[PDB]
Amino acid sequence: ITGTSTVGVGRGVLGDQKNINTTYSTYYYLQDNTRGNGIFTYDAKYRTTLPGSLWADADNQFFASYDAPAVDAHYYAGVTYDYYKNVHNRLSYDGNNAAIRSSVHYSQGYNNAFWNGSQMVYGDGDGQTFIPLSGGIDVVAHELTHAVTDYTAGLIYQNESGAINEAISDIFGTLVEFYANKNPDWEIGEDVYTPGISGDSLRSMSDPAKYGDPDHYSKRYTGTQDNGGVHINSGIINKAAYLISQGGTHYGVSVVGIGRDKLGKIFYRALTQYLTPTSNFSQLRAAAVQSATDLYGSTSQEVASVKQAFDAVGVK
Numbered sequence: 001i002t003g004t005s006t007v008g009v010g011r012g013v014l015g016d017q018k019n020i021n022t023t024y025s026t027y028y029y030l031q032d033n034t035r036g037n038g039i040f041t042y043d044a045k046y047r048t049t050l051p052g053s054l055w056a057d058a059d060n061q062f063f064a065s066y067d068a069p070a071v072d073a074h075y076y077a078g079v080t081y082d083y084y085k086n087v088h089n090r091l092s093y094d095g096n097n098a099a100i101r102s103s104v105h106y107s108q109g110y111n112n113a114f115w116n117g118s119q120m121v122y123g124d125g126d127g128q129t130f131i132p133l134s135g136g137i138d139v140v141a142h143e144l145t146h147a148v149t150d151y152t153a154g155l156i157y158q159n160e161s162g163a164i165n166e167a168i169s170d171i172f173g174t175l176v177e178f179y180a181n182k183n184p185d186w187e188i189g190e191d192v193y194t195p196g197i198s199g200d201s202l203r204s205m206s207d208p209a210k211y212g213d214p215d216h217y218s219k220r221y222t223g224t225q226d227n228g229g230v231h232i233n234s235g236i237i238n239k240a241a242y243l244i245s246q247g248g249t250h251y252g253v254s255v256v257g258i259g260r261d262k263l264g265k266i267f268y269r270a271l272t273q274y275l276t277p278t279s280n281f282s283q284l285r286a287a288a289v290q291s292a293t294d295l296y297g298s299t300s301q302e303v304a305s306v307k308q309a310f311d312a313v314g315v316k
């Protein structure tokens with residue numbers, strides 16, 4: 001909408017207060033004009049029609065319980081935009097400052113979030129498996145990263161290319177969580193998953209097997225559920241990424257960690273310069289090796305550590 005840029009205040013899903021960028025034109029809208037061609041947050045009103053209504057508020061204060069998922073979807077989309085711009089010199093998901101749109105209050109009891117090809121969508125959860133999913137900064141960044149992948153490598157959402165697609169979203173979701181620096185970890189979704197159980201998460205990158213996911217190519221899932229295991233076999237790549245950054249000895253193979261920033265540079269370059277829609281795990285290894293070579297040199301520790309990490313997870 002046309003209006004003037006304003007700053008509202010509200011509370012997110014976890015009860016924390018934050019300022020948000022809004023737009024005033026009769027109402028205050030969840031429309032942040034400070035980033036690209038805007039960040040826009042919509043109310044899906046418990047239905048499945050998308051996007052729903054651009055979020056309108058009478059007083060620019062967002063402290064109602066119903067407001068909380070919108071506050072966080074809007075704010076964390078801004079953090080994710082800032083990460084891509086400031087760290088990777090990427091302007092929104094398309095590289096051209098495309099408007100970023102999210103809908104909250106999608107459906108009833110909906111234990112998931114997704115990118116639908118055009119926008120982000122967040123359920124409220126059923127209150128037992130999830131609380132509203134935009135409360136997780138890693139979740140929000142996972143979703144926006146699907147848009148980045150779709151505009152760049154274009155990894156098809158099936159089998160190994162789809163597991164790479166998933167891992168890219170977990171990797172950058174985690175790197176955004178570290179960028180914001182509030183309780184960062186190598187776990188996925190912990191802030192919104194299972195409110196009645198402390199210390200768990202949907203997936204672990206540091207130890208995927210904690211939640212049943214493979215941590216070695218020999219343990220990969222080969223069936224048809226979950227689009228050929230895209231959220232399962234992502235553990236193999238998540239583990240490799242974790243090892244590149246943090247190091248470790250895994251199935252007897254030692255990896256010297258090179259840190260999160262270099263992990264992010266290597267994988268961002270692989271995603272945007274070398275991967276293709278049908279890349280498999282072996283092709284990802286080659287893309288990561290080439291990316292590290294471009295950035296750090298063929299004889300660098302960074303290249304050596306990429307090779308060790310893929311060796312450790314059984315990907316040649």
Ligand SMILES: CC(C)C[C@H](NP(=O)(O)CNC(=O)OCc1ccccc1)C(=O)NCN
Nearest residue numbers: 112113114115116117139142143157189231
């Ligand atoms: C981080 C988690 C809390 C949420 C995450 N959800 P996701 O992996 O973005 C689902 N996307 C999808 O199916 O895209 C496929 C698709 C394509 C077009 C239209 C609709 C759907 C997940 O791990 N969900 C499984 N628990």
Ligand SMILES: [Ca+2]
Nearest residue numbers: 057059061062
């Ligand atoms: Ca209000």
Ligand SMILES: [Ca+2]
Nearest residue numbers: 182183184185
């Ligand atoms: Ca965390």
Ligand SMILES: [Ca+2]
Nearest residue numbers: 138187188189
């Ligand atoms: Ca996390």
Ligand SMILES: [Ca+2]
Nearest residue numbers: 193194195197
């Ligand atoms: Ca929990």
Ligand SMILES: [Zn+2]
Nearest residue numbers: 142146166169
């Ligand atoms: Zn995903």
